[PDB]
Design a protein around this ligand. Structure first.
Ligand code: MG
Ligand code: MG
Ligand code: MG
Ligand code: MG
Ligand code: MG
Ligand code: MG
Ligand code: MG
Ligand code: MG
Ligand code: MG
Ligand code: MG
Ligand code: MG
Ligand code: MG
Ligand code: MG
Ligand code: MG
Ligand code: MG
Ligand code: MG
Ligand code: MG
Ligand code: MG
Ligand code: MG
Ligand code: MG
Ligand code: MG
Ligand code: MG
Ligand code: MG
Ligand code: MG
Ligand code: MG
Ligand code: MG
Ligand code: MG
Ligand code: MG
Ligand code: MG
Ligand code: MG
Ligand code: MG
Ligand code: MG
Ligand code: MG
Ligand code: MG
Ligand code: MG
Ligand code: MG
Ligand code: MG
Ligand code: MG
Ligand code: MG
Ligand code: MG
Ligand code: MG
Ligand code: MG
Ligand code: MG
Ligand code: MG
Ligand code: MG
Ligand code: MG
Ligand code: MG
Ligand code: MG
Ligand code: MG
Ligand code: MG
Ligand code: MG
Ligand code: MG
Ligand code: MG
Ligand code: MG
Ligand code: MG
Ligand code: MG
Ligand code: MG
Ligand code: MG
Ligand code: MG
Ligand code: MG
Ligand code: MG
Ligand code: MG
Ligand code: MG
Ligand code: MG
Ligand code: MG
Ligand code: MG
Ligand code: MG
Ligand code: MG
Ligand code: MG
Ligand code: MG
Ligand code: MG
Ligand code: MG
Ligand code: MG
Ligand code: MG
Ligand code: MG
Ligand code: MG
Ligand code: MG
Ligand code: MG
Ligand code: MG
Ligand code: MG
Ligand code: MG
Ligand code: MG
Ligand code: MG
Ligand code: MG
Ligand code: MG
Ligand code: MG
Ligand code: MG
Ligand code: MG
Ligand code: MG
Ligand code: MG
Ligand code: MG
Ligand code: MG
Ligand code: MG
Ligand code: MG
Ligand code: MG
Ligand code: MG
Ligand code: MG
Ligand code: MG
Ligand code: ZN
Lengths: 77, 252, 91, 112, 63
RNA sequence: UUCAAAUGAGAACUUUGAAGACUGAAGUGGGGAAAGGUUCCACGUCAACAGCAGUUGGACGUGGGUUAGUCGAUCCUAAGAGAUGGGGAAGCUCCGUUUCAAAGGCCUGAUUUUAUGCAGGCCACCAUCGAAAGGGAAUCCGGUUAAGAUUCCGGAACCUGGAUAUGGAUUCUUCACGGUAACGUAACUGAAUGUGGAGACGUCGGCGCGAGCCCUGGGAGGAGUUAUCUUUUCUUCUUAACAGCUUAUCACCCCGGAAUUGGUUUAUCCGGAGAUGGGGUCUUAUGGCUGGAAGAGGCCAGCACCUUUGCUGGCUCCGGUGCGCUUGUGACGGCCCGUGAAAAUCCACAGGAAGGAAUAGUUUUCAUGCCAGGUCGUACUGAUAACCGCAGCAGGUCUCCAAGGUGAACAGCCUCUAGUUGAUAGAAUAAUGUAGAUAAGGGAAGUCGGCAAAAUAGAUCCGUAACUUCGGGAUAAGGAUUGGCUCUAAGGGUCGGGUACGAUCAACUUAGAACUGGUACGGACAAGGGGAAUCUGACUGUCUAAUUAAAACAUAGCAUUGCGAUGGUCAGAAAGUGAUGUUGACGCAAU
RNA sequence: AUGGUGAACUAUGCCUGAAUAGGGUGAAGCCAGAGGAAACUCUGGUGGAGGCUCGUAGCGGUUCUGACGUGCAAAUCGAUC
């Protein structure tokens, strides 16, 4: 039910006690007027709401995923 | 034969009065320490229509001499009273439209409304749209005071008996024709079930002293004795004269 | 463009009820719908609503009055008379 | 063309049974029932909707922070500012004229 | 097809009409259109300075 | 209604395919309330039953089926019903419901025998039942069944109660700051008591906006037609509760000080009690963007194979228009001798009892976190066969959703979606019928009587008498006109213009003018006969369900009567009984 | 005669709910204009009143003294109203 943009805040969520699972979605999407680009939504299933953080920059996306806690049960796709 | 209409009204089945919408009973303040030694101020907080009444009520609120709180009385608005006006109730109150004073405390010719028959009965005389009573004199020793009610009747009451200065609001209401059956229809819809009215002369004998015959006609004098009995008293009960009132009325 | 010769607001009733009753209604009708002067705020913005209740558009004071007109002849003389009677009692 | 049924068992058009047509992700029309509209709280003095205050149906006011139920002046959510302007002025002026009456009628008692 | 012939003016003679001139298009609608448009010409004209408030104000009530 | 197949001993009647029609969204569609009670669904199956039949069934046999913290009940009060101290009554019982009654329970303090005795203060509100349409805490979308689903599955929320820590906030100026102000916010102690708000409220009119529906352009797909013509016809292109930000008519604030009065609605209201102008504050209906969420659903293509049935790819995009239609909502306006419920419940404010920090306190109305949410209903019918009429009866029985054309239109007539195609059948077409039509010349001569029937009818224009309460009478009467096609003219929106015009996009109305036909044209449907008088009731309204709708009753209007409460009229066996009466002569009662 | 049972029909009141295509007419209020020495009189608009009106659904039940009259039906069916 929540969207999130502070990439710092996000991280802190995923290390909260109640957070057992997560999921990464990937969408094809097109930019501005012309070409496409790879959108990636990071979803953290909290106890009472699903936080989802969108990273348009596919770059930011990769070296985000390797930040993800080694203990979190991530759902890929 | 059958029980006639006017005896049926008394069991109040479909004849009780339609009441759902009414504001509350109109009443003076209880005749307490304040009101009988001095006076007490209130404010009309609203003057408002009461279903099936002809005259608007005024909600007037007061402080409670004995507790921290408000107490709201429901008055009948005298013509000219208004929201925000201050209302004074008491023996030692001043003579203004809206205040409530003991008929002993007011000069002859005073014009008041909602007056009590016995002190404290919280008001009984002249309440209807337009009516009032007039003080036509006092008699200090045994403190009685004498008024003329709207009927024309002169009557005397305790000088302690309270009344409210001025006349009741909404006057003239009856100079305007009802014009159609529907406006009487709605009129009684908010009073009681007394409309419309079948002439007994249009009924059969089972139904009414007047009923039956091969032409419609009352068949005997329609002036019935006081000492008549239920099912008998229809028409002009106890009528001491009858016929069109030629000549000026007005009590002598 | 004058619309009606004499029935005025009373034209809603058509031919019904007979002239003389319509006459009598037209009067109080005109009385009762009209806009009146406000004693308190000065603007002429008192209109009726339910008999004997008169309220101000802006400023919002409500007065009890006649069923079809703000002040009633009787009420007014009664105002004059109490006035006079009060005068005696502190003079 | 797509028509639509009530959702609760009550088949009548009452104030508690208002409907809204709605287009779902299935690509179809479905009714939704609709709570009666909330009305704006009113000034206790003058009576207008008092501004600054949220408007919900009554029990919903207990699921809402106290800031949604006030403005921050004396008599916040209760009476309407202009009404409190009047209250202050008159309070002052009257308490003042009390002092006036006291000393005037006091002097009566010294020259009469 | 037909709709075209309509907004080409066709099929609209006295013989094709069944509702009163009123019911087809209300007098009131005609007016409110017209009155709103004069009203709105006055506003911009005033606001542009093309016409001064005093003149506008007379044209308003003449409108 | 028809052809054929299938099944079966058996087929006018079952099943499937095909064709022909129908209901025509005011439904023969999709659901419900009352009532039924298993009729629902499946398998088996024809003795009775379904006024022919039967292989079929709402029949017969055997089974299966109705899942809830959020939908209802349950809670609240309405008219009203009805216990209790009492009062009547031989008594069954009747009256009273806060009434002539010693009518009761909460917050915590007091306890550290110990568990709950008393120490404060309040509160005096006096049962209870009464709404499956009134009030009311909270759930949605996709998927799934032979038969259930806002109830199951998936996912995503939210309410109430209970627990509670962590973070934030607050505090050395203890109980936040900011803004001139309207007011702002993530928070930002608050008992008794008092007050205010919400719950919470008529009706109709036009005007404004929303939603869904309707119409429609481009594009990307699938389908149909193609002798000929049509860049064509038909169809898919969707987005829930909930959450963040944003969004408003109204209202309000600050600056200002107005005649040459201005501003202004379709509707004439507003201003020295401060207009117009400029700047700001507010409600969040509603909408927008994002999260929910493309992973769903929708539409296609390309491979796979008795199989569970897969698997793999795509596309699911951008717009337009309005006196449209339905519904919603707003700011207004009309009306009233009519002014259009209640209570439970929720919040706020006034108040300041009290409690509370610097060596560390106060704070769960800010965020996040934990546990829990019982009981009963839930199938289906809702009617030319599931209900009431002895019945599968042409009767009766409360409601919501509602497409295209014609047209004023929710009319009639035709159509899409859905649903039907049920209702004994065959052959003939005598009399007499019932229902539907026509008739030369005459035209009410028929008949108690123009009964029946015929005539009239839309719209535009023209024209319109007596009489009248001046409102009417009036569509009075009487007339012309109306198709098709092709043109002409008038009626609008939006932009930039130093402090006259230009440019483009989108609408059916109205009037004029040509041409044209077997002089037809409201071409079916739809749709007033008119006039002159007498009698009679003023009018609208009312009744004899099932032989009387009328002149009968009612009504407004007029007039008469009774009554100031220790009362009038009326109820009761009685009464500390009752109607009028939440009443008071501008009233109630009786003619 | 005595003691009992009925307001599921219907009559009337009360409480709480719900329902009614599309037309014609054009009442108060309002705006602009005209005439007149004056008093005052006129015109065009706007607006949208009514136990108003044409007419569906609704509600009713006038005539055919129509159907039916061992009925579909112990009150129905059709047209007309
Ligand atoms: Mg009563
Ligand atoms: Mg009656
Ligand atoms: Mg009578
Ligand atoms: Mg009478
Ligand atoms: Mg008789
Ligand atoms: Mg007799
Ligand atoms: Mg006698
Ligand atoms: Mg007689
Ligand atoms: Mg007689
Ligand atoms: Mg349902
Ligand atoms: Mg606030
Ligand atoms: Mg707010
Ligand atoms: Mg008009
Ligand atoms: Mg318009
Ligand atoms: Mg415009
Ligand atoms: Mg003006
Ligand atoms: Mg057959
Ligand atoms: Mg058809
Ligand atoms: Mg239809
Ligand atoms: Mg059927
Ligand atoms: Mg069903
Ligand atoms: Mg049943
Ligand atoms: Mg079955
Ligand atoms: Mg057999
Ligand atoms: Mg059977
Ligand atoms: Mg048989
Ligand atoms: Mg057989
Ligand atoms: Mg069985
Ligand atoms: Mg069984
Ligand atoms: Mg609920
Ligand atoms: Mg319960
Ligand atoms: Mg009792
Ligand atoms: Mg109850
Ligand atoms: Mg309920
Ligand atoms: Mg309810
Ligand atoms: Mg589903
Ligand atoms: Mg199942
Ligand atoms: Mg089902
Ligand atoms: Mg679930
Ligand atoms: Mg979950
Ligand atoms: Mg909680
Ligand atoms: Mg802060
Ligand atoms: Mg309260
Ligand atoms: Mg209130
Ligand atoms: Mg209500
Ligand atoms: Mg479509
Ligand atoms: Mg919701
Ligand atoms: Mg502004
Ligand atoms: Mg500012
Ligand atoms: Mg409706
Ligand atoms: Mg009102
Ligand atoms: Mg509140
Ligand atoms: Mg103390
Ligand atoms: Mg909290
Ligand atoms: Mg419990
Ligand atoms: Mg069901
Ligand atoms: Mg059936
Ligand atoms: Mg039986
Ligand atoms: Mg039947
Ligand atoms: Mg069916
Ligand atoms: Mg048959
Ligand atoms: Mg035959
Ligand atoms: Mg002939
Ligand atoms: Mg002839
Ligand atoms: Mg003859
Ligand atoms: Mg002749
Ligand atoms: Mg003859
Ligand atoms: Mg004769
Ligand atoms: Mg003869
Ligand atoms: Mg005839
Ligand atoms: Mg002929
Ligand atoms: Mg005539
Ligand atoms: Mg022509
Ligand atoms: Mg043009
Ligand atoms: Mg009559
Ligand atoms: Mg009549
Ligand atoms: Mg009869
Ligand atoms: Mg009989
Ligand atoms: Mg009749
Ligand atoms: Mg007379
Ligand atoms: Mg006694
Ligand atoms: Mg009944
Ligand atoms: Mg309604
Ligand atoms: Mg209508
Ligand atoms: Mg017409
Ligand atoms: Mg009409
Ligand atoms: Mg002149
Ligand atoms: Mg009208
Ligand atoms: Mg009528
Ligand atoms: Mg009519
Ligand atoms: Mg019509
Ligand atoms: Mg009918
Ligand atoms: Mg009727
Ligand atoms: Mg009859
Ligand atoms: Mg009939
Ligand atoms: Mg017959
Ligand atoms: Mg026969
Ligand atoms: Mg009819
Ligand atoms: Zn005023």
């Amino acid at each position: 039910a929540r969207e999130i943009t502070d990439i710092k805040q996000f991280l802190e969520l995923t290390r909260r006690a109640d957070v057992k699972t997560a999921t990464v979605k990937i969408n094809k999407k097109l930019n501005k007027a012309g070409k496409p680009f790879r959108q990636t939504k990071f979803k953290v299933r909290g106890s009472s709401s699903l936080y989802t953080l969108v990273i348009n920059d596919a770059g930011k996306a990769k070296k985000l995923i390797q930040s993800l806690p080694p203990t979190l049960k991530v759902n890929r796709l | 034969g059958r029980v006639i209409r006017n005896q049926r009204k008394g069991a109040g089945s479909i004849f009780t009065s339609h009441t759902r919408l009414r504001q509350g009973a109109a009443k003076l303040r209880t005749l307490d320490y304040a009101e009988r030694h001095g006076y007490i101020r209130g404010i009309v907080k609203q003057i408002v229509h009461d279903s099936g009444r002809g005259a608007p009520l005024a909600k007037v609120v007061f402080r409670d001499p004995y507790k921290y709180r408000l107490r709201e009385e429901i008055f009948i608005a005298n013509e000219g009273v208004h929201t925000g006006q201050f209302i004074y109730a008491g023996k030692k109150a001043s003579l203004n439209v809206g205040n409530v004073l003991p008929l002993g405390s007011v000069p002859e010719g005073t014009i008041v409304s909602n007056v009590e028959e016995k002190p404290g009965d919280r008001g009984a005389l002249a309440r209807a749209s337009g009516n009032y009573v007039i003080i036509i004199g006092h008699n200090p020793d045994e403190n009685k005071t004498r008024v003329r009610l709207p009927s024309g009747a002169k009557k005397v009451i305790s000088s302690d008996a309270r009344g409210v200065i001025g006349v009741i609001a909404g006057g003239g209401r009856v100079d305007k024709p009802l014009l159609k059956a529907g406006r009487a229809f709605h009129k009684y819809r908010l009073k009681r079930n007394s409309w419309p009215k079948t002439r007994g002369v249009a009924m059969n004998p089972v139904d009414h002293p007047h009923g039956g015959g091969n032409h419609q006609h009352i068949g005997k004098a329609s002036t019935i004795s006081r000492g008549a009995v239920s099912g008998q008293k229809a028409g002009l009960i106890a009528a001491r004269r009858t016929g069109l009132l030629r000549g000026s009325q007005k009590t002598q | 463009a004058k619309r009606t010769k004499k029935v005025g607001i009373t034209g809603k009733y058509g031919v019904r009820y007979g002239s003389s009753l319509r006459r009598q209604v037209k009067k109080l009708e005109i009385q009762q719908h009209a806009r009146y002067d406000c004693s308190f705020c000065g603007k002429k913005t008192v209109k009726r609503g339910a008999a004997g209740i008169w309220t101000c558009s802006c400023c919002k004071k409500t007065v009890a009055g006649g069923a079809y007109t703000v002040s009633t002849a009787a009420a007014a003389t009664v105002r004059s008379t109490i006035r006079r009677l009060r005068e005696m009692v502190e003079a | 063309a797509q028509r639509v049924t009530f959702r609760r068992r009550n088949p009548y058009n009452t104030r508690s049974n208002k409907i809204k047509v709605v287009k779902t992700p299935g690509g179809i029309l479905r009714a939704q029932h609709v709570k009666k509209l909330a009305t704006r709280p009113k000034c206790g003095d003058c009576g207008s909707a008092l501004q600054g205050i949220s408007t919900l149906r009554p029990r919903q006011y207990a699921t809402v922070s106290k800031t949604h139920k006030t403005v921050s002046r004396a008599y916040g959510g209760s009476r309407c500012a202009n009404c409190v302007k009047e209250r202050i002025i008159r309070a002052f002026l009257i308490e003042e004229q009390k002092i006036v009456k006291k000393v005037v009628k006091e002097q009566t008692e010294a020259a009469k | 097809a037909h709709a075209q012939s309509k907004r080409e003016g066709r099929h609209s003679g006295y013989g094709k009409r069944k509702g009163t001139r009123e019911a087809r298009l209300p007098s009131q609608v005609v007016w409110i259109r017209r009155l709103r448009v004069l009203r709105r010409l006055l506003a911009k004209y005033r606001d542009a300075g093309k016409i001064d408030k005093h003149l506008y104000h007379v044209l308003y009530k003449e409108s």
